Write a protein that binds this ligand. Structure first.
Ligand SMILES: Cc1cc2nc3c(=O)[nH]c(=O)nc-3n(C[C@H](O)[C@H](O)[C@H](O)COP(=O)(O)OP(=O)(O)OC[C@H]3O[C@@H](n4cnc5c(N)ncnc54)[C@H](O)[C@@H]3O)c2cc1C
Length: 388
């Protein structure tokens, strides 16, 4: 029976635990593995907007998410001289409304994992090889141990090892949106109180906020650049490049960058999207960022993870475990919605910053209202199936 179908879920993030939840609810018996030793606390703030709120509520975790929601009360667009150009309430500032909510990744994963306390999960575990045939998927773990599964669903992030193991370069694209993003935590030296500041130029943007940790502040950087690092993963090159890229930005960048060396959670990466004609091959399926990362410029990453988890789990249910039918339905039903949200991400990367003009209240206000309207449109641009 479906209960006895062996399903491996790789990755304890959003999509992995989410699909595990729905698989378990729909009468399957998934297992989780995780390369990290444990769920990393805090981290990047994630939006739950559009369809994802409905799914979150059905999962019975919505109130828990709200209890752990970010609490920015005020967001401000400021010029390099510190003057306020445009101010908005926190949710509106984050282009959210209605029942939509923002939460730090670590807080959400913790809630997700509590919702699946029954499902087996193994941390500090990694797959080093995958081979499949018509009957089974043979998984080789780090220590050389082998296990066979009926299905493997990989939710191991944008830099998916599984994607590289299973798919060829002709079967997926790494779409570069021509910009870099960086972030790190520093002492709240300005003494911000549940407030975010945002300064921008023609090709660059800098944010600074404090929220749940009163004596800490999260710095953010975004900028367009055709420059390519000799080693994009070299953290020292990343910092030199970031410092050099913003050396004439003004405002608080000097004060932020002076504190960058002592920050312990430094992050830097190109803004990228994953585009695949098919997220599946045989008995293996990709989900979440591994399959269709819309990049942070979209604000849809979480939304796509939840919807994907629901649909893939659902189609497997209706197919009574028949993965060939389910994976086809998974690809067909979800691609337009994914492509819609990715294109919104592409649009943001091309048009958010003003290439020729300086920003003002009217621009920031008009741009904000437009993004709020457009994001609401795309995030709800799917008629979700009802598998129950
Ligand atoms: C700076 C930044 C800002 C963002 N802002 C937003 C936003 O405002 N709104 C929004 O909706 N989205 C945002 N995102 C995107 C969002 O974080 C992700 O889309 C979302 O977390 C999807 O989660 P996932 O489970 O698909 O992937 P992840 O959450 O990345 O899952 C990866 C997990 O898999 C594990 N893993 C990795 N490799 C392996 C392996 N080989 N074997 C086993 N396990 C492995 C890792 O330990 C990790 O726990 C942002 C991302 C970044 C980087």
């Amino acid at each position: 029976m479906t209960k006895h179908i062996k399903i491996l879920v790789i990755g304890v993030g959003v999509a992995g635990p989410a699909v595990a939840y729905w698989l378990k609810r729909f009468g399957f018996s998934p297992v989780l593995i995780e390369k990290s030793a444990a769920v990393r606390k805090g981290g990047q703030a994630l939006d739950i907007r559009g369809i994802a709120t409905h799914i979150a509520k059905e999962m019975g975790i919505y109130d828990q998410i709200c209890n752990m929601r970010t609490q920015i009360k005020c967001g401000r667009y400021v010029d390099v001289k510190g003057n306020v150009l445009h101010e908005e309430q926190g949710e509106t500032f984050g282009f959210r409304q209605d029942d939509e909510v923002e939460i730090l990744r670590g807080d959400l994963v913790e809630i997700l994992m509590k919702a699946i306390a029954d499902i087996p999960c193994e941390f500090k575990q990694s797959v080093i090889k995958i081979e499949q045939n018509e009957d089974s998927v043979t998984v080789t773990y780090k220590d050389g141990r082998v296990e066979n599964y009926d299905l493997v669903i990989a939710a191991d992030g944008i830099h998916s090892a599984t994607r590289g193991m299973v798919f060829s370069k002709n079967e997926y694209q790494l779409i570069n949106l021509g910009s870099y993003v960086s972030a790190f935590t520093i002492p709240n030296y300005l003494g911000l109180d549940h407030m975010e500041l945002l300064c921008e130029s023609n090709h660059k943007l800098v944010t600074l906020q404090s929220d749940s940790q009163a004596d800490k502040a999260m710095a953010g950087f975004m900028f367009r650049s055709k420059h390519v690092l000799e080693d994009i993963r070299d953290e020292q090159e990343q910092k030199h490049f970031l410092h050099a890229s913003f050396q004439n930005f003004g405002w608080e960048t000097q004060n932020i960058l002076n504190r960058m060396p002592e920050s312990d959670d430094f992050y830097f990466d190109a803004i990228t999207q994953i585009k695949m004609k098919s997220w599946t091959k045989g008995r293996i399926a990709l989900i979440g960022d591994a399959a269709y990362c819309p990049s942070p410029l979209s604000g849809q990453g979480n939304n796509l993870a939840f919807v994907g988890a629901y649909i893939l789990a659902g189609e497997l249910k209706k197919a009574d475990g028949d993965y060939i039918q389910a994976f086809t339905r998974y690809n067909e039903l979800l691609h337009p919605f994914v492509e819609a949200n990715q294109q919104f991400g592409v649009w943001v990367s091309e048009s958010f910053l003003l290439k020729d003009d300086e920003v003002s209240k009217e621009i920031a206000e008009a741009r904000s209202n437009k993004i709020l309207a457009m994001i609401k449109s795309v995030s709800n641009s799917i008629n979700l199936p009802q598998y129950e």
